[PDB]
């Protein structure tokens, strides 16, 4: 019914056989057949299907109001499976600032296979309409994006994609199914790095894909069985487990995000703050129209590299590590950690200043996180 | 020193920190950094590297006398990573009868990306030399093959590939590193479905790749990090564990294989038997030159479909399931289970008769397995 | 600092070696020694200590403001370890209505070893003072208790125990360290069935013990190493993981508990309601003095057995199963499931009527849980 | 049929529901009930029973030709459960040189509960008959024992126990069910530290108990459910897995043991060698009558402490660690590691000289292990 209930009771996450209230971990590769071709419960080889992976697929299908779910060994494995729906000569439109691993896969792997790619600022959807070529097959958007949290209108992207015969894809990692459901907005395929909020405990690398489209689902299933980037049963189980607390975690994170943003906007050592909840943020109205909460990723500007490093060292509760969506609050400097390969002046032009800090808000106490960052900002 | 010792002490499979005599299971996704860019032990994100996966990679590199190892979420994920070394327009030569999942990936996925593929009978290596096009980049061989155990000369394939500038790849699943080491024979890349003998307990779906080539290793690492078909830590641990008993298991299996083949050749209800140990087998001398033992996969002909099904039902210790390399002995009918999509007359032409039976010998008692199959054959 | 922060950053739950932000799972039994007796990090045999178990012990010590932690294979293993601090002829005072497994262990196992036991209504602490014999060594209390949630004054029990030289023990399962810390109130030893709220996901059977007493800790360590009821590394890891969300879960549960109690008190098909938050509840003031929140266990009276069974069948979000502290809301009938062995008239005398229902509130949406139970109560 | 077959197909280690050829890992604590008291498959709470633990219990019952199996969190947890069959005032006869953890539990824990214990040299069974008191309830023997491998006649111990109404128990760790089956010889209860050979990979701490006695089984079940020293599902699964290779491992170990003993007896730096295969060993005939193979534990005398330490440092394939039954060969000095608490002169009197070395033979190559130890012995 309501979301926190659906998180607990949605999907199949009990054992029909023994009644176990948690999904059994089928650490197995093959299955007995009573007669050639007669499978007791549909299973014959774990690559093709595994009952624990099936459980987590069922969960992500349910939570995104889709019909079919797919678990891959990582977010980029999910993304590659989706891109492999295309053929050489086909063309993809993506938002200009996609995740660096997505960019790296597309421009360094799939263009070698004849996939054509254009990166486009989708904060104006007419920019998509201009980018459409006769060969364009796919529209792939993240919203909001990293690390500047640019918002793209999901419903209009869906309409554009429908009118031009495009497979529409949304990378919904930053919002999770708890706050944003692209399938409800006409999108064909939604995916996630479950490594982030869904697993939620920094202990699983996984990707999840959902669709309501039977034919796209058949093609994704064939790709996943042929290229084999499948999530194992232990990790599927840990995903199912971590998703149970997703609503509580996201809501704690959102409370903290509101307070932290008030603090950041007030503080003199902080310049621009990037987050879709700020009403002056580009496409704020759009985000509130397609989502009923916020991501825990915030970026803000301190003065320079040394200010940023001092910030990191002076916090007690912000941890320096890769990834986002942990229980811990994480802190990073994109210009040094994710965009250090881009030349400095291009970084500056794009907004990736040396003092740009990205925090991923965790589930620590709101007051502690506000106070800790402030006292660290006070030391500049 | 000797192989059973190297299986126990080869690779890094203890914890340097605590002294744990088994590899810790790093069920983790990210790692603390003491300063931006300073990684305590080289780890920063589990997709890129994970210490348990690193352990199993170290093992497969050691066992194949390579320098670099790679663990993927399945055998076909390893194969796809290797194929993604190529670009559109490049061409691959494979043995005509490759594993059906390899064939399916190549002809249904990678040709859509402009990879050109020719399937060629490599039991005569000059057939490779004829198939070489100006665009040919890769030579990929299984030996022995499924389900008829056709043998390909690995060292000559390596020489051909060297002389023509081809990346040479051997799928070494059926023999394991215990009996056959393609890298020692000049091959550039060796891979395995670790789902089969290496894991050895029917409880892990995994692939493993080894190379001594620094530049090929860099490209494989980049592909694996960008497309993300990585083996998880729990499965890496179970692989490391199962590999410990590989020598003992393979040797039990080989003893059983010798006895079972004597029985099969003697029995009147059995016609042709396919296995490289039979001296009349094509390229028997070649196999004995490149290997010092045998695969546990045998195929043999009974009269028809009903004979085969009666065989399956009458055995007590042969289990009907997919996969091979279990502790259990497995039995299957290719014509119904792996080649049922091919038209019947093509099946017949290729040797896949309705009565062709494939067994994968397990580690049960030799006498029990010989006697059980015989009494089942006696009921025809 | 504040509790939700301490839950994330309290204890040692990262890897010092690799920087892994989660505790590695040391699925290992023994450890290399560089020289006889020189242990790299203190480990020599997993029964005696295991680094994953050490992590969870560190967590429970931190969360209870103790100094030493101990993980056992179940709550009753923890309880038995504590009771084995005593010698034959020694005497224990417990609250009259202890958990049935505690009662069963004490009266059916440990009295056969000469441990003397008296069950006493500790809601009046002077009742403890009367029960003190010259042989009395231990005072063991649960608060609040099952299934009627009787409250015992922890601080006065601590004072009594100090003055009479008793080892004081509190079973703190129902409240968790998040709401009640008996060690801060003078108690010598606190324990938990971590099977319930701490693990919190119905997927671990475990016990946890904490103390600040060095000498009691030495004796508990010796007992645990000699009788061997140790929690394994995988379960220790899952405990550490589940404890991260304990504050969020308990707080969601508490919000639901307040609303559900308002509903129950209003409903005509419900008679008495048992929960320490009700101001007419015996020792309500005491509970609010020793705790800053509430357990999720509520009991209430419907009319009879058939009413109770109809309730169970008519709910959509209350699940019929054993245990408490799940993410799911659980429902049970003590008179049939936990006290069916007691004669009916004794049941009635004790308050365990046929229509006594026990719910353990989960983390589903508050409104859904209130509405679901009401509409089920409406069908009576 | 034959033992290696029974190891693979004995017990229930597949999933009836999905056909999974390996036991699912029920990482769960509780089970749904369709109606109050109606359990779908007999499960209601994992402490009481868990389907993965049930699988391993089934295996150990099968392998010991018993009827009931029990998995505990460690060998000493199994031993304590068995001892808790007794009441205060009851008396136990054990062999004089029992495992130090058994001795420590009995004399430091259970005597505090009024259990009386006598340690007796059972290599002459009439020594048991003399030790029998009117209060004697249990006869507990290890054979062969640690570290001097003293052999006790199991069948005569069974007869004595029957005639005097004693519960007879054999700790069968060192021999495993593969070579010695005390239940077939009249013994009431057999147990194991599965930490050693059965798990076989140094990655599980576990105990296993088997019996054919329905009433003893009821009492063991009640004890295990009340005191709660249960083996978790992940460890139960790893036990089931490791037991598959037990025959192959034990047989490799036995081949190595024969060769290593020839070498040791020949070498001039080695004095006495203790192992039941040596024909001059006390009760050699008895051992060959009750077993059809050998333990992998050997002890032998070098000259002194410095010789022993030089031996340890000079080997390449003998690892210094606690425990036995690994895949690795392990080496230890009892006088320093397991008997360092006993005064020196008592050590000497008992045979625990400073130069007494204990090796546990692993599954490395036989020649490597013989040669490695010899060249290390050559450096003295
Ligand atoms: C309430 C509920 C739903 C409803 O899903 P919506 O499409 O969001 O209304 C789905 N699944 C479960 C298990 C529920 O309890
Ligand atoms: C003996 C030994 C080797 C030797 O490897 P080969 O190339 O086959 O000679 C390698 N690693 C370990 C651990 C060994 O013990
Ligand atoms: C704040 C904090 C504490 C403080 O504990 P209290 O005794 O409750 O004040 C302890 N540990 C950590 C990690 C903390 O962050
Ligand atoms: C052969 C066989 C047995 C026979 O057991 P024994 O008592 O040793 O003869 C038992 N179980 C299985 C599965 C077997 O295959
Ligand atoms: Na459900
Ligand atoms: Na649609
Ligand atoms: Na090693
Ligand atoms: Na080479
Ligand atoms: Na910490
Ligand atoms: Na105190
Ligand atoms: Na079986
Ligand atoms: Na008997």
mmCIF file of C-alpha atoms in Angstrom, chain D residues 166-354:
data_model
loop_
_atom_site.group_PDB
_atom_site.id
_atom_site.type_symbol
_atom_site.label_atom_id
_atom_site.label_comp_id
_atom_site.label_asym_id
_atom_site.label_seq_id
_atom_site.Cartn_x
_atom_site.Cartn_y
_atom_site.Cartn_z
ATOM 1 C CA UNK D 166 27.041 -46.772 30.679
ATOM 2 C CA UNK D 167 26.438 -44.340 27.848
ATOM 3 C CA UNK D 168 29.447 -45.005 25.611
ATOM 4 C CA UNK D 169 30.926 -42.087 23.620
ATOM 5 C CA UNK D 170 33.757 -42.063 21.089
ATOM 6 C CA UNK D 171 35.424 -38.859 19.903
ATOM 7 C CA UNK D 172 36.121 -40.012 16.341
ATOM 8 C CA UNK D 173 37.754 -36.811 15.023
ATOM 9 C CA UNK D 174 41.164 -38.246 14.207
ATOM 10 C CA UNK D 175 39.858 -41.176 12.138
ATOM 11 C CA UNK D 176 36.707 -39.607 10.539
ATOM 12 C CA UNK D 177 33.699 -41.722 9.484
ATOM 13 C CA UNK D 178 35.721 -42.734 6.439
ATOM 14 C CA UNK D 179 37.940 -45.136 8.383
ATOM 15 C CA UNK D 180 36.251 -45.887 11.710
ATOM 16 C CA UNK D 181 32.564 -46.173 12.648
ATOM 17 C CA UNK D 182 32.116 -46.570 16.418
ATOM 18 C CA UNK D 183 28.330 -46.948 16.138
ATOM 19 C CA UNK D 184 28.876 -50.140 14.148
ATOM 20 C CA UNK D 185 30.905 -51.410 17.111
ATOM 21 C CA UNK D 186 28.193 -50.925 19.753
ATOM 22 C CA UNK D 187 29.060 -47.378 20.838
ATOM 23 C CA UNK D 188 26.069 -45.248 21.803
ATOM 24 C CA UNK D 189 27.279 -41.816 20.639
ATOM 25 C CA UNK D 190 30.014 -40.734 18.229
ATOM 26 C CA UNK D 191 31.206 -37.149 17.895
ATOM 27 C CA UNK D 192 33.690 -35.081 15.889
ATOM 28 C CA UNK D 193 35.368 -31.748 15.790
ATOM 29 C CA UNK D 194 34.295 -31.102 12.207
ATOM 30 C CA UNK D 195 36.770 -28.211 12.426
ATOM 31 C CA UNK D 196 39.382 -30.812 11.511
ATOM 32 C CA UNK D 197 39.148 -33.406 8.698
ATOM 33 C CA UNK D 198 35.420 -33.316 7.931
ATOM 34 C CA UNK D 199 35.227 -29.657 6.970
ATOM 35 C CA UNK D 200 38.804 -30.211 5.858
ATOM 36 C CA UNK D 201 39.620 -26.698 4.641
ATOM 37 C CA UNK D 202 40.480 -24.815 7.886
ATOM 38 C CA UNK D 203 37.512 -22.525 7.377
ATOM 39 C CA UNK D 204 34.777 -23.866 9.714
ATOM 40 C CA UNK D 205 34.672 -24.315 13.492
ATOM 41 C CA UNK D 206 32.008 -26.979 14.092
ATOM 42 C CA UNK D 207 31.080 -30.141 15.979
ATOM 43 C CA UNK D 208 29.021 -33.128 14.843
ATOM 44 C CA UNK D 209 27.290 -35.846 16.895
ATOM 45 C CA UNK D 210 25.624 -39.037 15.649
ATOM 46 C CA UNK D 211 23.599 -41.758 17.377
ATOM 47 C CA UNK D 212 21.243 -44.626 16.567
ATOM 48 C CA UNK D 213 19.569 -44.329 19.968
ATOM 49 C CA UNK D 214 16.131 -42.674 19.814
ATOM 50 C CA UNK D 215 16.091 -41.790 23.502
ATOM 51 C CA UNK D 216 19.633 -40.445 23.609
ATOM 52 C CA UNK D 217 18.745 -38.500 20.469
ATOM 53 C CA UNK D 218 15.714 -36.963 22.168
ATOM 54 C CA UNK D 219 17.883 -35.888 25.089
ATOM 55 C CA UNK D 220 20.609 -34.454 22.852
ATOM 56 C CA UNK D 221 17.970 -32.538 20.873
ATOM 57 C CA UNK D 222 16.489 -31.110 24.072
ATOM 58 C CA UNK D 223 19.928 -30.078 25.333
ATOM 59 C CA UNK D 224 20.901 -28.480 22.046
ATOM 60 C CA UNK D 225 17.649 -26.542 21.880
ATOM 61 C CA UNK D 226 17.895 -25.391 25.490
ATOM 62 C CA UNK D 227 21.600 -24.439 25.659
ATOM 63 C CA UNK D 228 21.754 -23.314 22.025
ATOM 64 C CA UNK D 229 25.247 -24.197 20.789
ATOM 65 C CA UNK D 230 23.960 -24.683 17.229
ATOM 66 C CA UNK D 231 25.961 -24.596 14.005
ATOM 67 C CA UNK D 232 24.859 -21.794 11.689
ATOM 68 C CA UNK D 233 23.593 -22.396 8.152
ATOM 69 C CA UNK D 234 26.623 -21.009 6.306
ATOM 70 C CA UNK D 235 28.984 -23.240 8.296
ATOM 71 C CA UNK D 236 26.653 -26.235 7.893
ATOM 72 C CA UNK D 237 26.788 -25.652 4.140
ATOM 73 C CA UNK D 238 30.583 -25.424 4.091
ATOM 74 C CA UNK D 239 30.737 -28.678 6.091
ATOM 75 C CA UNK D 240 28.466 -30.481 3.630
ATOM 76 C CA UNK D 241 30.705 -29.163 0.865
ATOM 77 C CA UNK D 242 33.999 -30.159 2.472
ATOM 78 C CA UNK D 243 32.766 -33.644 3.344
ATOM 79 C CA UNK D 244 32.334 -34.446 -0.383
ATOM 80 C CA UNK D 245 36.122 -34.671 -0.808
ATOM 81 C CA UNK D 246 36.796 -36.449 2.500
ATOM 82 C CA UNK D 247 37.586 -39.844 1.002
ATOM 83 C CA UNK D 248 39.991 -38.454 -1.603
ATOM 84 C CA UNK D 249 41.686 -36.242 0.987
ATOM 85 C CA UNK D 250 42.022 -38.983 3.636
ATOM 86 C CA UNK D 251 43.431 -41.377 1.047
ATOM 87 C CA UNK D 252 46.005 -38.896 -0.240
ATOM 88 C CA UNK D 253 46.897 -38.173 3.400
ATOM 89 C CA UNK D 254 47.254 -41.893 4.150
ATOM 90 C CA UNK D 255 49.629 -42.470 1.216
ATOM 91 C CA UNK D 256 51.733 -39.567 2.421
ATOM 92 C CA UNK D 257 51.621 -40.858 6.007
ATOM 93 C CA UNK D 258 53.026 -44.256 5.016
ATOM 94 C CA UNK D 259 55.916 -42.702 3.105
ATOM 95 C CA UNK D 260 56.647 -40.068 5.757
ATOM 96 C CA UNK D 261 56.798 -42.734 8.465
ATOM 97 C CA UNK D 262 59.290 -44.822 6.464
ATOM 98 C CA UNK D 263 61.435 -41.692 6.127
ATOM 99 C CA UNK D 264 61.134 -40.764 9.822
ATOM 100 C CA UNK D 265 62.023 -44.235 11.045
ATOM 101 C CA UNK D 266 65.080 -44.218 8.766
ATOM 102 C CA UNK D 267 66.352 -40.776 9.719
ATOM 103 C CA UNK D 268 69.134 -40.492 12.339
ATOM 104 C CA UNK D 269 67.913 -37.169 13.786
ATOM 105 C CA UNK D 270 64.582 -38.809 14.715
ATOM 106 C CA UNK D 271 64.083 -41.095 17.695
ATOM 107 C CA UNK D 272 60.650 -42.481 18.589
ATOM 108 C CA UNK D 273 57.751 -42.181 16.115
ATOM 109 C CA UNK D 274 54.123 -42.424 17.328
ATOM 110 C CA UNK D 275 51.446 -43.607 14.895
ATOM 111 C CA UNK D 276 49.071 -46.614 14.965
ATOM 112 C CA UNK D 277 50.329 -47.966 11.610
ATOM 113 C CA UNK D 278 53.728 -48.867 13.100
ATOM 114 C CA UNK D 279 53.461 -52.559 13.950
ATOM 115 C CA UNK D 280 55.350 -52.158 17.255
ATOM 116 C CA UNK D 281 52.776 -49.566 18.335
ATOM 117 C CA UNK D 282 50.702 -50.554 21.343
ATOM 118 C CA UNK D 283 47.324 -51.957 20.213
ATOM 119 C CA UNK D 284 48.269 -51.870 16.526
ATOM 120 C CA UNK D 285 46.265 -55.064 15.980
ATOM 121 C CA UNK D 286 43.301 -53.460 17.753
ATOM 122 C CA UNK D 287 43.418 -50.410 15.509
ATOM 123 C CA UNK D 288 43.585 -52.501 12.357
ATOM 124 C CA UNK D 289 40.615 -54.464 13.703
ATOM 125 C CA UNK D 290 38.417 -51.393 14.226
ATOM 126 C CA UNK D 291 39.571 -49.175 11.329
ATOM 127 C CA UNK D 292 40.584 -49.582 7.695
ATOM 128 C CA UNK D 293 42.930 -46.629 7.427
ATOM 129 C CA UNK D 294 44.907 -44.133 9.421
ATOM 130 C CA UNK D 295 44.798 -40.684 10.877
ATOM 131 C CA UNK D 296 47.078 -38.043 9.362
ATOM 132 C CA UNK D 297 48.500 -37.019 12.756
ATOM 133 C CA UNK D 298 52.041 -38.225 13.451
ATOM 134 C CA UNK D 299 54.316 -37.359 16.336
ATOM 135 C CA UNK D 300 58.058 -37.927 16.487
ATOM 136 C CA UNK D 301 61.036 -36.972 18.657
ATOM 137 C CA UNK D 302 63.904 -34.767 17.595
ATOM 138 C CA UNK D 303 66.574 -33.970 20.165
ATOM 139 C CA UNK D 304 65.361 -30.774 21.869
ATOM 140 C CA UNK D 305 63.556 -27.456 21.521
ATOM 141 C CA UNK D 306 66.143 -25.916 19.183
ATOM 142 C CA UNK D 307 66.072 -28.923 16.851
ATOM 143 C CA UNK D 308 62.270 -28.674 16.698
ATOM 144 C CA UNK D 309 62.312 -24.942 15.917
ATOM 145 C CA UNK D 310 64.992 -25.433 13.255
ATOM 146 C CA UNK D 311 62.816 -28.158 11.717
ATOM 147 C CA UNK D 312 59.844 -25.805 11.590
ATOM 148 C CA UNK D 313 61.862 -22.990 9.996
ATOM 149 C CA UNK D 314 63.647 -25.244 7.472
ATOM 150 C CA UNK D 315 60.535 -26.871 5.980
ATOM 151 C CA UNK D 316 58.954 -25.246 2.969
ATOM 152 C CA UNK D 317 55.631 -27.138 2.970
ATOM 153 C CA UNK D 318 54.948 -27.616 6.710
ATOM 154 C CA UNK D 319 53.019 -24.683 8.168
ATOM 155 C CA UNK D 320 53.170 -23.599 11.812
ATOM 156 C CA UNK D 321 49.589 -23.201 13.041
ATOM 157 C CA UNK D 322 47.002 -24.675 15.460
ATOM 158 C CA UNK D 323 44.394 -27.317 14.428
ATOM 159 C CA UNK D 324 44.783 -30.434 12.156
ATOM 160 C CA UNK D 325 43.057 -31.918 9.099
ATOM 161 C CA UNK D 326 43.798 -28.988 6.784
ATOM 162 C CA UNK D 327 44.586 -29.258 3.105
ATOM 163 C CA UNK D 328 47.972 -27.831 4.168
ATOM 164 C CA UNK D 329 50.376 -29.908 6.212
ATOM 165 C CA UNK D 330 50.637 -28.450 9.723
ATOM 166 C CA UNK D 331 53.490 -28.680 12.229
ATOM 167 C CA UNK D 332 53.512 -27.969 15.962
ATOM 168 C CA UNK D 333 55.465 -28.531 19.168
ATOM 169 C CA UNK D 334 53.067 -29.767 21.880
ATOM 170 C CA UNK D 335 55.463 -29.006 24.752
ATOM 171 C CA UNK D 336 55.341 -25.313 23.772
ATOM 172 C CA UNK D 337 51.854 -24.977 22.277
ATOM 173 C CA UNK D 338 49.434 -27.416 23.951
ATOM 174 C CA UNK D 339 51.244 -28.654 27.088
ATOM 175 C CA UNK D 340 53.304 -25.588 28.047
ATOM 176 C CA UNK D 341 51.200 -25.180 31.203
ATOM 177 C CA UNK D 342 52.206 -28.605 32.569
ATOM 178 C CA UNK D 343 55.495 -28.487 34.529
ATOM 179 C CA UNK D 344 58.499 -29.611 32.501
ATOM 180 C CA UNK D 345 59.254 -32.799 34.446
ATOM 181 C CA UNK D 346 55.632 -33.959 34.219
ATOM 182 C CA UNK D 347 55.785 -33.276 30.471
ATOM 183 C CA UNK D 348 58.896 -35.440 30.222
ATOM 184 C CA UNK D 349 57.281 -38.207 32.282
ATOM 185 C CA UNK D 350 54.215 -38.223 29.994
ATOM 186 C CA UNK D 351 56.277 -38.404 26.791
ATOM 187 C CA UNK D 352 55.842 -34.726 25.852
ATOM 188 C CA UNK D 353 59.557 -34.063 25.431
ATOM 189 C CA UNK D 354 60.805 -30.654 24.290
#
